[PDB]
Amino acid sequence: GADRMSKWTSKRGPRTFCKGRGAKGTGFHGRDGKFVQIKEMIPELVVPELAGFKLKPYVNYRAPEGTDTPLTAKQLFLETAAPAIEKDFKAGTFDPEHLEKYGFEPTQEGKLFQLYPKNFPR
Amino acid sequence: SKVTLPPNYRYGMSRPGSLSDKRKNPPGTRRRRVPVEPISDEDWHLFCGDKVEILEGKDAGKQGKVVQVIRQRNWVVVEGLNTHYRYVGKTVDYRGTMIPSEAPLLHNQVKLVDPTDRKPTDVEWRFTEAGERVRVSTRSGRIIPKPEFPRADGIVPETWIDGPKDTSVEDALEKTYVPRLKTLEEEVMEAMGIQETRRHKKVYWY
Amino acid sequence: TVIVERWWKVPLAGEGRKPRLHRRHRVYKLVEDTKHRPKDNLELVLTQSVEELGVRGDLVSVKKSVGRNRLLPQGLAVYASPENKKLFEEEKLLRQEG
Amino acid sequence: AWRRDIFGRIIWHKFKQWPIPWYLNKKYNRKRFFAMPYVERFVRMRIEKQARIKARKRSLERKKEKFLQEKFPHL
Amino acid sequence: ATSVSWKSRTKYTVMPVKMRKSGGRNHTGQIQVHGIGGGHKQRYRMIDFLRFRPEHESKPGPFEEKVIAVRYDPCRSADIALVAGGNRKRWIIATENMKAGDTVLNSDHIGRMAVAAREGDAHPLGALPVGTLINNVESEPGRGAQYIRAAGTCGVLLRKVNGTAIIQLPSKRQMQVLETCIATVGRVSNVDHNKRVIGKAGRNRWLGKRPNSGLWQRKGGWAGRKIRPLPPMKSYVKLP
Amino acid sequence: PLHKVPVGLWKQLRLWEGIYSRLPRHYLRSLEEARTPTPVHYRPHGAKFKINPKNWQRERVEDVPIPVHYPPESQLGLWGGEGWVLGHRYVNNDKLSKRVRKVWKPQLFQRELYSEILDKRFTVTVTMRTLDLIDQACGFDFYILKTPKEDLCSKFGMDLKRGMLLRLARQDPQLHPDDPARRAAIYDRYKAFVIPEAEAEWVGLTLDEAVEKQRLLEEKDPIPLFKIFVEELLGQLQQQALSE
RNA sequence: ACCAAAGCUAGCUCAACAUACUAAACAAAUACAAAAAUACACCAAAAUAAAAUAAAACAUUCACCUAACAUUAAAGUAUAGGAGAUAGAAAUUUUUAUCCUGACGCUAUAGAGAUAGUACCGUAAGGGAAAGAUGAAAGAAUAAAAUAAAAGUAAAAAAAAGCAAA
RNA sequence: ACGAGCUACCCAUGAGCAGUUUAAAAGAACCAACUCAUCUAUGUGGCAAAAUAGUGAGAAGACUUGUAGGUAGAGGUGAAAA
RNA sequence: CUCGCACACGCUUACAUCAGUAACUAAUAAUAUACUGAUAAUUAACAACCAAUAAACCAAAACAACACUAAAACGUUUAUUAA
Ligand SMILES: [Mg+2]
Ligand SMILES: [Mg+2]
Ligand SMILES: [Mg+2]
Ligand SMILES: [Mg+2]
Ligand SMILES: [Mg+2]
Ligand SMILES: [Mg+2]
Ligand SMILES: [Mg+2]
Ligand SMILES: [Mg+2]
Ligand SMILES: [Mg+2]
Ligand SMILES: [Mg+2]
Ligand SMILES: [Mg+2]
Ligand SMILES: [Mg+2]
Ligand SMILES: [Mg+2]
Ligand SMILES: [Mg+2]
Ligand SMILES: [Mg+2]
Ligand SMILES: [Mg+2]
Ligand SMILES: [Mg+2]
Ligand SMILES: [Mg+2]
Ligand SMILES: [Mg+2]
Ligand SMILES: [Mg+2]
Ligand SMILES: [Mg+2]
Ligand SMILES: [Mg+2]
Ligand SMILES: [Mg+2]
Ligand SMILES: [Mg+2]
Ligand SMILES: [Mg+2]
Ligand SMILES: [Mg+2]
Ligand SMILES: [Mg+2]
Ligand SMILES: [Mg+2]
Ligand SMILES: [Mg+2]
Ligand SMILES: [Mg+2]
Ligand SMILES: [Mg+2]
Ligand SMILES: [Mg+2]
Ligand SMILES: [Mg+2]
Ligand SMILES: [Mg+2]
Ligand SMILES: [Mg+2]
């Protein structure tokens, strides 16, 4: 009989079995049967300029490392918002109702790169 | 990368993925299990690079420097003390280079020696008032410094020259992170001036 | 409604345990089917002056068919509960006194 | 979401991105996130099999510890 | 699995529609009728048995149509006829002497005087003479022609009483219906259908008749010449 | 090996642990209690002790309920607590004769019933027993509000009871918007079944429905940690200000 | 002298306690023809256990037979039974908290089927194995010691006559 | 529970039949491809758990055949051979 | 002596280059498409996925002129929307 442990790929079936190998789609089917490719569906690699970049894939061997201190939400908040909140509270202009001026986003549906829905691949 | 080993694996002073170990034990072998006394990481006081003395064997009372330790079989090996002689250069019609290799030894046969009186002592772990855990001898009552040993890579930080593809120490240790509330994507877009006005539509998740 | 009785006796269980039922306890005998009995007669208090039965304010005994299909659905009569009977009794009292 | 498939297991079903709501989806509507009454028996077998595996692992470890203590009487 | 019927076509069309035969099997897939299957491919020509169907409600009176062609229908024994009136054409059941270019009248009017019964015309049963040969008889008003349809077969009007018509079917049974039921006059086409001779066992297979089973069954008490009396009149009128 | 807990207590332990423990206490106790349903297909005997005719001795005798199978379509109507009796019987009523599988079924009727509180006509399938119970209770509303769950044995009946209780407790003007006097008269005669709102919306709910309702009530979006950190920082700043 | 033989371990079994019970992995893809990112729906279903057997046959009956109330007694008693085989209570009584948990269980034809539900056998449901042995060190194989003890052969074919022996 | 990928019968969708004699595509005739399997001889742990060689019957039809679907055992299907 | 080339279905690297074959596969050797190891390979134009909604439309394929019966798969156009 046929195998069962082997993977069921597109090479193991008839002509009518044309299964994808995992690549993402890049368009749809047009009018006369051709494939219409959508430009926005094709990823655009945002590659920076490395001409003046003074860093290398390897570090110096004598360079010391540091104690592992993974970044947490508490540390990020202390670094980005705690000084501003403290200064505003000392000044007396602090407004608990409005926090959008401090980087807080009440709703993610407005901006481009959303965090919980994860609108961006990488 | 790491190699996987069967539970019925015997350690023979050879790298598990090495050709010699592969030829000694093929992937289809499962030998009898040897009894190994359970010694924890907090009670293993025999390190690599320290001077030790030999209790029993042909070289009774001789002292040597530890060169390797195998925690799986509780083995400690010293350089050129407990030795058997073997030929390494073997050909069809020539032989030579008969070198003395050395057999492993157990923790019950090897005990640490303090550098003060050079006499055998028993090592017990103690907690210092400075927050450090250093081995303290009991026969004499002195601390034994950690035997710093060179790593297997073979390079010492004191003499290192940067290649074309190595960062300088100042560049590697330079701090340029500004902890704001923007994603890497948003920061890169702002830095490179990529302007995007239109936004995503409603997407249902289920 | 069919009423059935077990052919075999079930062993006792007095501590509150469920009786140990067996396959032989699934054998039943139809002692009586209630649909074949002479059905009782429904008593209703009239609320309107009906031609066939009588005047509003009387307890009349009509069969369940007409009681459930004609008197009650159309509001021509009500049940003979004590609460409903007290209201008719007081209505009769005031009608007699005035 | 923590779902319960037809095999009785508790899985973490990740959500996929769709252009139409869940009640209008041909492919999603025929999926089943619930267990039929005939799955409790197999769930019980799974529980008992895992319990047996854990119990015999514990017994093996206890026997190994006792054998090591007998072989090395350093006490 | 369960199969779906081929008869999913809500729009009436003149062109023949392709049909999927099923030999005795029900929707489940098991045989319910034996001796059916392996015939010739056929296309179904939809027949409008409601002869009096005015094109628009604005003119619900009698109307005249013209016969375009009388053609062969594989799905029935009789020949069909294409009749065109206004902006639509319909397949009807051809009578004994329908030809191309003929004129047919479809009416729903009943008068005190009987109408001269033509062959292709369709009139209500209350307007036809007492001794008229009819076909495509309709049971309830506005229901359709379920009764006599086979080639050459025709019923005979017997008597009209109390606004109610009585007919005699080809099975010699009396059928009582309302006098307003529309029925076509005359014998159905292909009057020589009973005299056809199947030349060989292969023509039956062409028609789609599988051979009978070879199992020998002893006759029971059902067999024998049962001289039974004619069944009583089948009445469709609703007496209050 | 052996389970620590017998398999019989698995359901009770599952009800005790998890979201099932967050259900209201009255609902939990209402499902925990198990009242015996009234005898319908079998005739009970009065005394607990009876004299054996052949032995002439007093012996204890008890009631063994006859298993009744309720088909799924019984939950869409009011069958009066009766259903299908699945059992065996002896042909010719002789023990030594054959044993035959037998199914006894109730006679179903399609009747329209009026609800005074809900002001609606329901076309439901009922039995002569249901109609007789309605007659004895002197009203469809009274019958529904009086007969408990174990005697109704209908999810539709439980839903009707829940709706009636909710309407009575809310004093809804939807009954007779233009007849306040009629509405008050209707509501006053059912005053014996007034239930507080905290318990009147959990009477005709199954376990799955109750779990879904509790999950919907407890469903809250996770508040961002920015709010927690801001509150903590404000508290620390207030403490520092007050300590100086 | 070949073939061969012997290890003592991997692990299993039965109970007690027990948190209170579908382990870890779940980046992406997974009930399209599973592991195939992406389009206007349809979803759900219940209806008694039967028989092999015992009654030396077999028709009424036939303990347990995947539904909790445990233990000491009442008691194999009252009862139910082609009153046969057999089935069988109840009223009423007894039961003092925890550790003291390991083994007059097996040692590779045994103990789990398990080195594994894997190879292999079937279209599928499904069935389902056998296989390990040196040494402190093989980073001691011009490698060292114990048995050379089964059947089968060789060393070493046979010389009238006979259940092969006495 | 699992089985109509073999086979029995249907449902869709396709495909084959060259030459000769006949106003013929006539369930006509000769005979190929093709489909069956009459008789004999080998084979009988075989090439083969049903074959080889020769010889035979049909070969425009109630014909052969590819793909896919359906009918499931107290049944299916059957030009009845249980 | 002559069952060859390709496609469909099916198997999945058994295909190609180099090297080795004491032994393992060929029912034996030689060596190798059938064993062993290393390294490479099948590149789309051919094939698969590749519009709906209403209306006009009875008129067979068999060189199809025109017919027989067993009545026969196979299509365009118009209008509205087709990223
Ligand atoms: Mg297989
Ligand atoms: Mg393929
Ligand atoms: Mg292919
Ligand atoms: Mg393209
Ligand atoms: Mg037909
Ligand atoms: Mg015809
Ligand atoms: Mg016949
Ligand atoms: Mg016959
Ligand atoms: Mg017997
Ligand atoms: Mg016997
Ligand atoms: Mg017998
Ligand atoms: Mg017998
Ligand atoms: Mg039994
Ligand atoms: Mg008796
Ligand atoms: Mg007897
Ligand atoms: Mg008791
Ligand atoms: Mg074993
Ligand atoms: Mg021997
Ligand atoms: Mg002799
Ligand atoms: Mg099939
Ligand atoms: Mg088939
Ligand atoms: Mg020819
Ligand atoms: Mg011929
Ligand atoms: Mg032959
Ligand atoms: Mg010859
Ligand atoms: Mg031939
Ligand atoms: Mg011939
Ligand atoms: Mg012939
Ligand atoms: Mg039988
Ligand atoms: Mg049969
Ligand atoms: Mg016969
Ligand atoms: Mg026979
Ligand atoms: Mg193969
Ligand atoms: Mg190769
Ligand atoms: Mg060879």
* DSSP track, B93-155: S-EEEEEEEE--EETTTEEEB-TTT--B--EEEEE-TTS-EEEEESSS--B--------TT--
- The partner residue sitting opposite F88, judged by closest CB among C2, C26, C80, is C26
Tokens encoding E143: 């229901």
> In the block, which residue shows the tokens 């044309």?
A18
Task: With beta carbons less than 8 A apart as the criterion, state whether E149 and E78 touch.
Answer: yes
**Which of the 62-121 residues on chain E come under 7 Å of nucleic strand H at their beta carbon?**
none
- The partner residue sitting opposite C35, judged by closest CB among F61, F80, F107, is F107
Which of A69, A111, A112 is most worth mutating to test chain B (most B CB atoms within 10 A of its CB)? A112
Which of helix, strand or coil describes residue F206? coil
Alpha-carbon distance of F116 to F186, in angstroms, equals 7
Return the bridge partners of E160, or none.
Answer: E165
Alpha-carbon distance of F66 to F60, in angstroms, equals 19
Nucleotide nearest residue A19, measured CA to C1': G36
Task: With beta carbons less than 8 A apart as the criterion, state whether E161 and E30 touch.
Answer: no
CA torsion, ordered E121, E125, E127, E133, to nearest 10 deg: 60
Task: With beta carbons less than 8 A apart as the criterion, state whether E98 and E81 touch.
Answer: yes
Task: With beta carbons less than 8 A apart as the criterion, state whether F126 and F113 touch.
Answer: yes
Å resolution of this model?
3.2
Alpha-carbon distance of E120 to E184, in angstroms, equals 7
Q: Which residues in chain B touch residue A107, judged by CB atoms under 8 angstroms apart?
A: none
Question: CB atoms < 10 A from the CB of F232, how many?
Answer: 12
Alpha-carbon distance of F180 to F206, in angstroms, equals 35
CATH number at residue C49: 3.40.5.10
Alpha-carbon distance of E138 to E184, in angstroms, equals 9
Tokens encoding E183: 């029925």
DSSP assignment of F77-89 equals SB-TT--BEEEEE
CA of A21 to the centre of ligand 33 (A): 25
Alpha-carbon distance of E196 to D9, in angstroms, equals 70
Task: With beta carbons less than 8 A apart as the criterion, state whether F27 and F210 touch.
Answer: yes
Task: With beta carbons less than 8 A apart as the criterion, state whether B11 and B73 touch.
Answer: yes
Return the bridge partners of F50, or none.
Answer: F59
The number of helix segments (H) and strand segments (E) in chain B equals: 3, 10
Alpha-carbon distance of A66 to A57, in angstroms, equals 19
Q: Where are the beta strands (DSSP E) in F11-108?
A: 49-51, 58-60, 85-90, 99-104
On the CB side of E118, how many CA atoms lie within 13 Å of its CA? 12
SS3 of chain C: helix, strand, coil, percent, to 5: 30, 25, 45
Touch between chain E and chain A (3+ CB pairs, < 8 Å)?
no
CA angle B192, B195, B196 (to 5 degrees): 135
Alpha-carbon distance of E123 to E106, in angstroms, equals 6
Chain-centroid distance of CA B7 in Å reads: 21
Chain I bases having any atom below 7 Å from a protein CB? 8-13, 47-51, 54-55, 57-59, 70-74, 82-83
Helix extents (H) in D1-75 = 26-29, 40-71
Residues in CB range of F97: below 8 A, 6 or more apart:
F90, F91
- The partner residue sitting opposite B204, judged by closest CB among D22, D71, D74, is D22
Q: Distance (Å) from CA D53 to C1' G100?
A: 28
Alpha-carbon distance of E55 to E62, in angstroms, equals 11
CA of E218 to the centre of ligand 31 (A): 13
> In the block, which residue shows the tokens 């005074």?
F116
**CA dihedral sign, ordered F94, F95, F96, F97:** positive
Q: What residues are neighbours of ligand 7 (ion), with CB under 5 Å?
A: E 212
Alpha-carbon distance of C39 to C67, in angstroms, equals 13
Task: With beta carbons less than 8 A apart as the criterion, state whether C57 and C88 touch.
Answer: yes
The H or E element spanning position C84 is: helix C82-97
Return the bridge partners of F232, or none.
Answer: none
Task: With beta carbons less than 8 A apart as the criterion, state whether F95 and C29 touch.
Answer: no
Task: With beta carbons less than 8 A apart as the criterion, state whether E180 and E137 touch.
Answer: no
Nucleotide nearest residue E32, measured CA to C1': H71
The amino acid present at B34, given as its one-letter code, is: V
CA of F154 to the centre of ligand 34 (A): 74
CA of E92 to the centre of ligand 6 (A): 14
Tokens encoding F182: 């009629």
CA nearest neighbour of F85 among B197, C31, B156: C31
The amino acid present at A55, given as its one-letter code, is: L
Instruction: Report which bound ligand comes closest to the CA of A17.
Output: 2
Which of helix, strand or coil describes residue F91? helix
Alpha-carbon distance of E92 to E46, in angstroms, equals 9
Alpha-carbon distance of B43 to B49, in angstroms, equals 18
Tokens encoding B127: 């907690």
Chain-centroid distance of CA B72 in Å reads: 12
Query: How many residues are listed for chain B in this entry?
Result: 206
CA distances from E239 to D25, E25, E124, F36, F154 (A): 55, 41, 21, 55, 44
Q: How far is C3 from chain F (nearest CA, A)?
A: 5
Q: Distance (Å) from CA B26 to C1' I35?
A: 22
DSSP assignment of chain E equals -----S----S--SS-EE----SSB-SSSSBSSSSB------EE----------S-TT--S-EEEEEEEEE--TTSSSPEEEEEETTEEEEEE-BTT--TT-EEEE-----SS-----SS-EEEGGGS-TT-EEES--SSTTS---SS-STT--EEEEEE-SSEEEEE-TTS-EEEEETT-EEEESPBS-TTGGG----SHHHHHHHTBPPPP-------TT-S---PPPPPPEE-----
Chain G bases having any atom below 7 Å from a protein CB? 8-23, 26-50, 59-69, 78-80, 82, 88-92, 102-103, 105, 108, 115, 118-119, 122-124, 132-142
Q: Distance (Å) from CA D75 to C1' H45?
A: 71
Question: CB atoms < 10 A from the CB of C14, how many?
Answer: 8
Task: With beta carbons less than 8 A apart as the criterion, state whether E122 and E185 touch.
Answer: yes
CA nearest neighbour of F78 among F41, F110, F116: F110
CA nearest neighbour of F176 among F184, F168, F165, F188: F184
CA nearest neighbour of F65 among F150, F127, F126: F150
For residue E100, count CB atoms less than 10 angstroms from its CB and return exposed for 0-12, middle for 13-18, buried for 19 or more.
exposed
Q: How many domains does chain F have?
A: 1
Interface check A99 vs F, CB under 8 A? yes
Which of helix, strand or coil describes residue C62? strand
Alpha-carbon distance of D38 to F10, in angstroms, equals 17
Alpha-carbon distance of A101 to A103, in angstroms, equals 6
CATH code 2.40.50.140 region(s) in chain E:
1-107
Q: Distance (Å) from CA E89 to C1' I79?
A: 23
Interface check F15 vs C, CB under 8 A? no
Neighbours of chain C (3+ CB pairs under 8 A): F
Chain H bases having any atom below 7 Å from a protein CB? 9-13, 27, 61-63, 69-72, 76-81
Touch between chain D and chain B (3+ CB pairs, < 8 Å)?
yes
Alpha-carbon distance of F88 to C30, in angstroms, equals 11
CA angle D61, D67, D73 (to 5 degrees): 130
Residue nearest to nucleotide G138 (CA to C1'): B24
Nucleotide nearest residue E31, measured CA to C1': H71
Helix extents (H) in chain F = 10-16, 25-32, 128-137, 140-146, 149-152, 155-170, 180-188, 197-200, 207-218, 225-242
Q: Which CATH class name applies to E1-107? A: mainly beta
CA nearest neighbour of B10 among B151, B109, B104: B104
> In the block, which residue shows the tokens 């209630």?
C34
DSSP assignment of B148-177 equals ----TT---TTS----TTB--HHHHH----
Task: With beta carbons less than 8 A apart as the criterion, state whether A60 and B168 touch.
Answer: yes
Interface check A104 vs F, CB under 8 A? yes
Give the residue numbers spanning the domain of C47.
42-98
Give the residue numbers spanning the domain of F169.
1-244
Q: Distance (Å) from CA B106 to C1' H43?
A: 75
DSSP assigned state of F69: B
Closest-approach residue (CA) in chain D for F4: D51
Tokens encoding F150: 């174990």
CA nearest neighbour of E86 among E117, E119, E53: E53
> Determination method here?
cryo-EM
Nucleotide nearest residue E30, measured CA to C1': H71
Alpha-carbon distance of E160 to E167, in angstroms, equals 9
**Which of the 162-221 residues on chain E come under 7 Å of nucleic strand H at their beta carbon?**
199-203, 205-206, 208, 210-216
Question: CB atoms < 10 A from the CB of F134, how many?
Answer: 24
Describe the crossing of helices F225-242 and A73-80 by its angle, rounded to 10 degrees.
60
Tokens encoding F178: 């233009």
Residues in CB range of F175: below 8 A, 6 or more apart:
F117, F118, F119, F167, F183, F186, F187
Touch between chain A and chain F (3+ CB pairs, < 8 Å)?
yes
Alpha-carbon distance of C68 to C74, in angstroms, equals 10
**CA dihedral sign, ordered B44, B50, B52, B57:** positive
The answer to whether D43 CB is within 7 Å of strand G is yes
CA nearest neighbour of E134 among E119, E150, E112: E119
The topology under which CATH files domain E108-188 is: SH3 type barrels. (2.30.30)
Chain-centroid distance of CA F120 in Å reads: 22
Residues in CB range of E161: below 8 A, 6 or more apart:
none
Alpha-carbon distance of B17 to B4, in angstroms, equals 9
> In the block, which residue shows the tokens 């109702």?
A97
Describe the crossing of helices F225-242 and A82-91 by its angle, rounded to 10 degrees.
40
Alpha-carbon distance of E187 to E167, in angstroms, equals 14
Question: CB atoms < 10 A from the CB of E84, how many?
Answer: 13
Chain-centroid distance of CA F218 in Å reads: 24
Alpha-carbon distance of A12 to A4, in angstroms, equals 12
Question: CB atoms < 10 A from the CB of C17, how many?
Answer: 8
Provide Rg for chain E, Cα atoms. Answer: 21
CA of E198 to the centre of ligand 22 (A): 26
Tokens encoding B159: 């003499």
The amino acid present at B79, given as its one-letter code, is: E
* F120-126 contacts at long range (C-beta below 8 A, 24 or more positions apart): F122/F160, F124/F76, F124/F77, F124/F78, F124/F156, F125/F73, F125/F76, F125/F77, F125/F78, F125/F79, F126/F77, F126/F78, F126/F79, F126/F80
Q: Report phi then psi at B89, rounded to 5.
A: -95, 100
For residue B100, count CB atoms less than 10 angstroms from its CB and return exposed for 0-12, middle for 13-18, buried for 19 or more.
exposed
Which of helix, strand or coil describes residue C86? helix
CB contact under 8 A, A74 and F234: no
The answer to whether B143 CB is within 7 Å of strand G is no
CA nearest neighbour of E93 among E83, E102, E101, E103: E83
Q: Report phi then psi at E64, rounded to 5.
A: -115, 140
CA of E37 to the centre of ligand 30 (A): 21
The answer to whether E5 CB is within 7 Å of strand H is no
Nucleotide nearest residue E37, measured CA to C1': H10
Task: With beta carbons less than 8 A apart as the criterion, state whether B147 and B49 touch.
Answer: yes
CA nearest neighbour of B46 among B159, B122, B150, B115: B122
Q: Report phi then psi at B192, rounded to 5.
A: -90, 0
CA nearest neighbour of F87 among C3, E165, B56, A64: C3
